[PDB]
Amino acid sequence: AGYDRHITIFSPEGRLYQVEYAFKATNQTNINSLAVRGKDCTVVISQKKVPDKLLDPTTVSYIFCISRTIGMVVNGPIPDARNAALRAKAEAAEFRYKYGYDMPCDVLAKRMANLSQIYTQRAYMRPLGVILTFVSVDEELGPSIYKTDPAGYYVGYKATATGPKQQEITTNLENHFKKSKIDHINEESWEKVVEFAITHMIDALGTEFSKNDLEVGVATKDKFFTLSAENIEERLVAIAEQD
Amino acid sequence: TQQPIVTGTSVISMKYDNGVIIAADNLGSYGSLLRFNGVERLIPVGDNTVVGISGDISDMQHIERLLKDLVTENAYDNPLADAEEALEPSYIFEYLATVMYQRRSKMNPLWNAIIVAGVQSNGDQFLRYVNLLGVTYSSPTLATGFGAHMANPLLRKVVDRESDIPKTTVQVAEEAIVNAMRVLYYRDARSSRNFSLAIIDKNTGLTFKKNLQVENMKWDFAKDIKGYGTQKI
């Protein structure tokens, strides 16, 4: 009965608390992150938090390169993180294998979206407490941002952030986008797009970032990728130049 | 009782308004090995007659040697063996066709498909085919085998029917021949780029041609084709 929270079954309200609690697990990692479609590119920035020395910090990412074209950022636990990318990893080549051309980003999203809805509907299946944002520069759709939830719900974004402080950057970019009025950051060098972002990440997070602070990635045409700390550093340096 | 061993490629021919045209490669083939480009599959006999032969060369070799004899025989006791008592594309064909069918019917066929390119003593284009089955037929165009499949269409597209022939110059067909030659040399593993051609004309008589090389092939666009498929690089 009260199990309705323990499990996925319609609450008296038709609600799914594990889901709602999976939502808890999402920022449970407490990593704030963003996805911004540049003009050419899509760029994703996130908090690289290195609590320990004993870490190999390099090993730490929630931004995952899904395909040739597609990467994704995870918001959620690294086990569940490491899972969906794997899950995602299959579909791409799969899709590509099956379909002769690479999977469009949202397709993966829509795909991965299907997944939790299953577990959502599949009681013993638990949904995953990760929030996922897929990005690429799509041969069709060019720069692309698709965030998915533990609920299998998903949508396209002119850009997005995600994390505990998501709303803040959300506002920031919403501010800046309602300002800028165009879906994408208009910059030809993703660098600028990054630099724009790291700005507006530093901006809304009110947070200066070292190069070890940032999980940084860029979806570019035909290649999603990320940066070393040095491009980051370059962003740290470059962004220190605008200001 | 036999099988192809030393094998001649397809033979193609057609008769034009004033005469006939025929070509076969200079190659001859042993298995996938294209063993001898020293193989002339077009065999002239007299002016009026040339013979295309495909299949067994040793047969053909054998065959051809039999033919001179006919001349030398037609020579014997024959002042006019040069004159009207000369051999005729009809005759030679007619003679030959008997053999194969027999050889066939003997269950010892001669392994070959053969066209007799001729233009008759009255100047009539003699174009008529004979197989190792000894079944024969005549038609404005005769191509053999691989050619018969591709070239006959071309040359039937050249001459759809008889009425086309009197309209059909040498070169118009001749062109299509070499074209068909390329065409065949396009699409056949066995086809040779180098080939020979003959033309018996009711007027010029025999016009034979050597070492004709298939040309005018487009190999360019091939570069544009990547893998077999979805491979994009």
Swiss-Prot record, chain A:
Main location as per UniProt: cytoplasm
CDD domains reported for this sequence: proteasome_alpha_type_6
Localization in the cell: Cytoplasm; Nucleus
Entry-linked PROSITE patterns: PROTEASOME_ALPHA_1, PROTEASOME_ALPHA_2
Keyword terms: Acetylation, Cytoplasm, Isopeptide bond, Nucleus, Phosphoprotein, Proteasome, Ubl conjugation
Other observations noted: Present with 15200 molecules/cell in log phase SD medium.
Entry-linked PANTHER family: PROTEASOME SUBUNIT ALPHA/BETA
Name this polypeptide is given: Proteasome subunit alpha type-1
Organism: Saccharomyces cerevisiae (strain ATCC 204508 / S288c)
The gene coding this protein: SCL1
UniProtKB/Swiss-Prot annotation, chain B:
Record InterPro entries: Ntn_hydrolases_N, Proteasome_beta4, Proteasome_bsu_CS, Proteasome_sua/b, Proteasome_suB-type
Family annotation (PROSITE patterns): PROTEASOME_BETA_1, PROTEASOME_BETA_2
Source species, domain of life: Eukaryota
GO biological process, one term: proteasomal ubiquitin-independent protein catabolic process
Keyword Cytoplasm: yes
Gene Ontology CC, one term: proteasome complex
Family, similarity comment: Belongs to the peptidase T1B family.
Role played: Non-catalytic component of the proteasome which degrades poly-ubiquitinated proteins in the cytoplasm and in the nucleus. It is essential for the regulated turnover of proteins and for the removal of misfolded proteins. The proteasome is a multicatalytic proteinase complex that is characterized by its ability to cleave peptides with Arg, Phe, Tyr, Leu, and Glu adjacent to the leaving group at neutral or slightly basic pH. It has an ATP-dependent proteolytic activity. PRE3 and PRE4 are necessary for the peptidyl-glutamyl-peptide-hydrolyzing activity.
UniProt protein name: Proteasome subunit beta type-7
Organism: Saccharomyces cerevisiae (strain ATCC 204508 / S288c)
